[PDB]
Scaffold this motif. Structure first.
Motif, short mmCIF file in Angstrom:
data_model
loop_
_atom_site.label_atom_id
_atom_site.label_comp_id
_atom_site.label_asym_id
_atom_site.label_seq_id
_atom_site.Cartn_x
_atom_site.Cartn_y
_atom_site.Cartn_z
N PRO A 71 0.82 -1.22 0.00
CA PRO A 71 0.00 0.00 0.00
C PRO A 71 0.85 1.27 0.00
CG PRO A 71 -0.79 -1.58 1.63
CD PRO A 71 0.55 -2.05 1.19
N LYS A 72 0.14 2.40 0.01
CA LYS A 72 0.76 3.70 -0.05
C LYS A 72 1.51 4.00 1.25
N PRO A 73 2.52 4.87 1.21
CA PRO A 73 3.23 5.23 2.45
C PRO A 73 2.44 6.09 3.42
CG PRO A 73 4.65 5.52 0.54
CD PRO A 73 3.27 5.30 0.01
N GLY A 74 1.21 6.50 3.09
CA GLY A 74 0.43 7.29 4.02
C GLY A 74 -0.28 6.48 5.09
N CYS A 75 -0.47 5.18 4.85
CA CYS A 75 -1.19 4.33 5.80
C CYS A 75 -0.23 3.47 6.62
CB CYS A 75 -2.20 3.45 5.06
SG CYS A 75 -1.43 2.25 3.97
N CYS A 76 0.76 2.87 5.96
CA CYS A 76 1.76 2.07 6.66
C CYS A 76 2.64 2.98 7.51
CB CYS A 76 2.59 1.30 5.64
SG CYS A 76 3.77 0.11 6.31
N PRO A 77 2.96 2.61 8.75
CA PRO A 77 3.70 3.52 9.62
C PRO A 77 5.15 3.70 9.18
CG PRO A 77 3.40 1.42 10.69
CD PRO A 77 2.56 1.38 9.45
N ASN A 78 5.62 4.94 9.25
CA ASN A 78 6.96 5.27 8.79
C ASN A 78 7.99 4.82 9.81
N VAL A 79 8.99 4.07 9.35
CA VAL A 79 10.07 3.58 10.18
C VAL A 79 11.36 4.23 9.70
CG1 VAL A 79 11.35 1.55 10.93
CG2 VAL A 79 8.89 1.42 10.62
N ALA A 80 12.14 4.78 10.63
CA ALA A 80 13.35 5.50 10.27
C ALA A 80 14.41 4.55 9.74
CB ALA A 80 13.89 6.26 11.48
N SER A 81 15.25 5.06 8.84
CA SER A 81 16.22 4.23 8.13
C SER A 81 17.50 4.07 8.94
CB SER A 81 16.53 4.83 6.76
OG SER A 81 17.21 6.06 6.89
N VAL A 82 18.11 2.90 8.82
CA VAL A 82 19.37 2.53 9.45
C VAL A 82 20.19 1.82 8.37
CG1 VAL A 82 20.40 0.97 11.17
CG2 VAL A 82 18.58 2.49 11.83
N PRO A 83 21.49 2.07 8.25
CA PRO A 83 22.31 1.28 7.31
C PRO A 83 22.35 -0.19 7.70
CG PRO A 83 23.68 2.66 8.72
CD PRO A 83 22.27 3.13 8.90
N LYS A 84 21.87 -1.03 6.79
CA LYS A 84 21.60 -2.43 7.08
C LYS A 84 22.89 -3.23 7.19
CE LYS A 84 20.08 -5.11 3.76
NZ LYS A 84 19.22 -5.61 2.65
N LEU A 85 22.78 -4.36 7.86
CA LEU A 85 23.90 -5.26 8.09
C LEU A 85 23.89 -6.29 6.98
CD1 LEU A 85 25.01 -6.55 11.51
CD2 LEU A 85 24.68 -8.23 9.74
N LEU A 86 24.97 -6.34 6.21
CA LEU A 86 25.02 -7.30 5.12
C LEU A 86 25.60 -8.63 5.58
CD1 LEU A 86 24.34 -7.64 2.22
CD2 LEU A 86 26.64 -6.98 1.60
N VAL A 87 26.83 -8.63 6.08
CA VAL A 87 27.48 -9.87 6.50
C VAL A 87 27.95 -9.69 7.94
CG1 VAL A 87 29.14 -11.65 5.89
CG2 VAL A 87 28.35 -10.07 4.12
N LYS A 88 27.80 -10.72 8.76
CA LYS A 88 28.31 -10.74 10.12
C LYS A 88 29.01 -12.06 10.36
CE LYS A 88 26.83 -10.61 14.96
NZ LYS A 88 27.81 -9.62 15.47
N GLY A 89 30.22 -12.01 10.92
CA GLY A 89 30.91 -13.25 11.24
C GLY A 89 32.36 -13.00 11.55
N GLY A 90 33.15 -14.05 11.40
CA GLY A 90 34.55 -14.04 11.77
C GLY A 90 35.42 -13.34 10.74
N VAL A 91 36.65 -13.85 10.63
CA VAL A 91 37.69 -13.20 9.83
C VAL A 91 37.39 -13.28 8.34
CG1 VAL A 91 39.10 -15.32 9.87
CG2 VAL A 91 40.21 -13.08 9.50
N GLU A 92 36.71 -14.34 7.93
CA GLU A 92 36.54 -14.62 6.49
C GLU A 92 35.36 -13.89 5.89
OE1 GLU A 92 36.75 -18.30 8.07
OE2 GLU A 92 34.71 -18.28 8.89
#
Lengths: 359, 53, 34, 53
Positions: free
Chosen positions: A1-22
């Protein structure tokens, strides 16, 4: 649906990969943020916890006592030392039309000492009491802190507290001092600073604390923050938190560029004596945490790639010893540079400095 | 064309305007100035600031 | 800056540095003379 | 003008990018590679495939 009905959530730079050294083998976009974190155990003369004859006193020192007979001869594991790491950084896409490329650049190192609540361990089977039937006096005294991030290893002006000391010779990997970085006998000039004793730092537990400070002259590509609080029974203080960020950016917005894609982390956190009940004393370091937040950014390369590779082929680039044309006490007298054109000066031997007219 | 400015020249003679000092040697053979760099203008960002020429 | 009220001299290549060995590092133009 | 092409030169230097291997001799006097052809384009059919140019 349109952005006027769904509640607005503030943006955060997303996490792509998480883990060890590799994780670091991943290919990111043009604009990304790596947040590599790491620790390092403090090398304190006792380098590794696997030698069974000396493992109980890991991250301590031995009986660090004055000798009383001139001159002194301290043991290899009697004197403290720095510690250095290197995380490996990936290849990343360059260019050839503009002679530009990418390098990793740290922006805001975060830090905290992770061993800080072990300092109140008053109960221990050797801590010297304050008085009869008392508790041992907890760990305090000499306090020292120095951490350093950077793309080149940090460099140092070597100045010893007295030139009469005789550090052990480094046949194996041993304590490299100002004696074995030049080869001469340690002159008494080295109690003050000296410009021809400028070693580099590339070993763990082999460049001691007691022989030098980091140089503030050549380290333009590595920042460092240091402190000291010394005295016998003086109280140490330390605040640790999770919401401090030390910004690494210089006056002109540049950062500590990874030179050969290295991110030299260098630390030493010697803090406190613990008093052995026989009267002996011992220095005790604590391990340091880091959180570097490397960011990709563009740069132009310093050197031409064409003339640079020709230096390797000995049929194409020769090198002779000859007589010294560089450094100190050489045999080249005057070098002129002529560029452009202007009106005629008063003589072709213009002196530029103001004072030397009476001589 | 005159090589030397006349105004800076006359300040050099008096001990009030150009103070001389028996100080530690900063000009000579044994001197202690290590890295004197001079900047000018602006250009693109070099790779490492310790450019070995 | 009036040319008719001030004499003119010849054109000579401008000195830029005179000194020791450590001034070969100077970034010069496309057409210099060393 | 640089006479040496750098892309033809830089590959010959590394051991990982150009691996050198201690195999059996494939050039010199004792070459075990016996016959090598090369084909470019297509003309009409020759007299016999044993002909040599």
């Amino acid at each position: 649906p349109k952005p006027g009905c769904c509640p607005n959530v503030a943006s955060v730079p997303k996490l792509l990969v998480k883990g060890g050294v590799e994780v670091l083998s991943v290919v990111t976009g043009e604009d990304s943020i790596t947040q590599i974190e790491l620790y390092l155990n403090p090398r304190m003369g006792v380098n590794s916890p696997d030698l069974p004859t000396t493992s109980n006193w890991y991250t301590y020192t031995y009986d660090l006592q004055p000798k009383g007979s001139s001159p002194d001869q301290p043991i290899k594991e009697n004197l403290p030392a720095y510690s250095v790491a290197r995380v490996s950084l990936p290849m990343l896409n360059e260019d050839i039309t503009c002679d530009t490329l990418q390098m990793w650049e740290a922006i805001s190192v975060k830090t905290e000492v992770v061993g800080i609540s072990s300092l109140i361990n008053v109960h221990y089977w050797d801590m010297k009491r304050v008085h009869d039937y008392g508790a041992g006096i907890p760990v305090s005294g000499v306090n020292y802190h120095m951490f350093a991030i950077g793309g080149e290893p940090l460099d140092l002006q070597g100045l010893v507290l007295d030139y009469q000391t005789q550090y052990p010779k480094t046949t194996n990997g041993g304590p490299i001092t100002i004696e074995t970085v030049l080869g001469r006998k340690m002159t008494p000039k080295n109690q003050g600073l000296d410009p021809q004793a400028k070693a580099k730092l590339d070993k763990d537990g082999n460049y001691p604390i007691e022989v030098w400070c980091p140089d503030p002259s050549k380290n333009e590509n590595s920042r460092y923050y240091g402190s000291i609080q010394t005295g016998s029974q003086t109280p140490t203080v330390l605040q640790f938190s999770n919401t401090l960020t030390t910004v690494l950016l210089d006056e002109n917005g540049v950062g500590p560029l990874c030179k050969g894609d290295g991110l030299f982390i260098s630390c030493a956190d010697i803090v406190g004596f613990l008093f052995k009940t026989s009267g002996k004393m011992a220095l005790h370091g604590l391990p340091r945490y880091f959180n570097v937040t490397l960011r990709k950014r563009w740069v132009k390369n310093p050197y031409p790639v064409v003339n640079l590779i020709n230096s390797l082929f000995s049929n194409l680039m020769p090198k002779v010893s000859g007589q010294p044309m560089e450094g100190k006490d050489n045999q080249v007298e005057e070098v002129r540079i002529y560029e452009g054109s202007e009106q005629l000066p008063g003589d072709p031997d213009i002196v530029r400095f103001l004072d030397k007219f009476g001589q």
